[PDB]
Amino acid sequence: RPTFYRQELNKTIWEVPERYQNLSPVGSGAYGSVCAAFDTKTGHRVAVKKLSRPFQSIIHAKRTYRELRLLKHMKHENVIGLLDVFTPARSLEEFNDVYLVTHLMGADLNNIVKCQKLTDDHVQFLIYQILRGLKYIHSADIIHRDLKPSNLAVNEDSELKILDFGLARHTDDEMTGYVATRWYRAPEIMLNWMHYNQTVDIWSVGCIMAELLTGRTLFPGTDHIDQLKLILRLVGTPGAELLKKISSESARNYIQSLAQMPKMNFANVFIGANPLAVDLLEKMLVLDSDKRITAAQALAHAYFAQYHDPDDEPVADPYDQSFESRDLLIDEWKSLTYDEVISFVPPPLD
Ligand SMILES: C[S@](=O)c1ccc(-c2nc(-c3ccc(F)cc3)c(-c3ccncc3)[nH]2)cc1
Numbered sequence: 562r563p564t565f566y567r568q569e570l571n572k573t574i575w576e577v578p579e580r581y582q583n584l585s586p587v588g589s590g591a592y593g594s595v596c597a598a599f600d601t602k603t604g605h606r607v608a609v610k611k612l613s614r615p616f617q618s619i620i621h622a623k624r625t626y627r628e629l630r631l632l633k634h635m636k637h638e639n640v641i642g643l644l645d646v647f648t649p650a651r652s653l654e655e656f657n658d659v660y661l662v663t664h665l666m667g668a669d670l671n672n673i674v675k676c677q678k679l680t681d682d683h684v685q686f687l688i689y690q691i692l693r694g695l696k697y698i699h700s701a702d703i704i705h706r707d708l709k710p711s712n713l714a715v716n717e718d719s720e721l722k723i724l725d726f727g728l729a730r731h732t733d734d735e736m737t738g739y740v741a742t743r744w745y746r747a748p749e750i751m752l753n754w755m756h757y758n759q760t761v762d763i764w765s766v767g768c769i770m771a772e773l774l775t776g777r778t779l780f781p782g783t784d785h786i787d788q789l790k791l792i793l794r795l796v797g798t799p800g801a802e803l804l805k806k807i808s809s810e811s812a813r814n815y816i817q818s819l820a821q822m823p824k825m826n827f828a829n830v831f832i833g834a835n836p837l838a839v840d841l842l843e844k845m846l847v848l849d850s851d852k853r854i855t856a857a858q859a860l861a862h863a864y865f866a867q868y869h870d871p872d873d874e875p876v877a878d879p880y881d882q883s884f885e886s887r888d889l890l891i892d893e894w895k896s897l898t899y900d901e902v903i904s905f906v907p908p909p910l911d
């Protein structure tokens with residue numbers, strides 16, 4: 562067991578192995594606290610995340626287990642994975658803190674869009690990387706569910722990774738009621754219209770891509786009703802085929818209660834944009850989740866011809882999500898998490 566040292570930063574207590582030096586706060590929130598640090602063992606700059614109250618409730622405990630299981634699984638250039646995971650606890654009994662370690666990423670798209678638009682060539686590269694990462698995630702039957710600029714980390718050389726994936730599993734219970742994530746959420750997950758699949762994430766990508774090309778939020782709704790209004794203004798009110806598949810009577814009632822909207826010509830809306838980009842946007846921003854383009858299909862779109870390589874767009878090992886259906890106690894989840902900490906094999910430095 563390594564030598565730990567203690568430190569207070571922004572009122573948060575950090576206890577980490579000595580190999581991690583020069584801890585510097587990069588952000589905090591509900592998810593937890595992140596510090597940038599220097600890993601003296603490897604020479605690499607890293608981000609260290611301390612989980613907030615990992616075992617405060619069953620939901621917290623289950624969420625903690627979930628995140629650790631997810632991060633241990635992710636082995637892809639466009640998805641954050643685990644360099645290390647540690648606790649300062651010496652046994653299960655005193656285990657109440659979890660720290661996660663990944664390669665440091667300078668920024669996110671939330672602040673790369675700054676408040677200006679990108680070039681078409683830059684967008685191509687960023688969206689390509691998002692899609693390549695989503696292909697991998699989707700292949701393991703993992704759905705992000707809350708993809709947005711702030712959870713896409715980017716380097717100074719414009720290399721991109723998805724973070725906070727697979728954790729949008731709150732379901733009903735709000736408490737955490739977060740906002741401004743509705744802007745990128747697919748209609749069917751926000752309003753629980755119809756059966757939802759992996760292409761909930763493609764909708765988000767469509768919204769992100771739109772925003773990078775124009776410098777504007779595509780659908781800046783102030784609530785669920787406003788949000789849907791803004792969406793239907795662009796894509797048009799559901800046709801015959803799609804109305805039939807709406808499982809909710811309330812939703813279906815509401816849609817049909819609204820003044821009918823035509824689908825707009827995207828060439829008009831996205832005026833001046835690369836017509837390959839517009840075409841891809843058309844395929845991404847379709848209400849019918851059965852007809853929305855998939856990650857793998859999006860990668861093969863001609864918009865990405867400069868980057869697409871079917872021999873280097875890998876899929877994921879099988880991921881066991883059976884734990885998700887289980888109703889266990891705090892101490893069970895917490896013990897399952899501890900097991901996962903102990904069994905963590907550091908990835909080879911090469
Ligand atoms: C506010 S939004 O919900 C949100 C959620 C998580 C993060 C967020 N989580 C991490 C993060 C760090 C380490 C780790 F092991 C897992 C995740 C990072 C991170 C990773 C690498 N370099 C810089 C920062 N950012 C950021 C924003």
Ligand SMILES: O=S(=O)(Nc1ccc2[nH]c(C3CCC3)nc2c1)c1ccccc1
Nearest residue numbers: 636637642643644663664908909910911
């Ligand atoms: O899960 S990871 O893929 N692990 C991993 C471990 C060691 C690595 N060293 C290198 C360099 C390329 C030659 C040396 N990439 C490496 C990748 C991963 C990648 C990025 C962030 C977190 C986790």
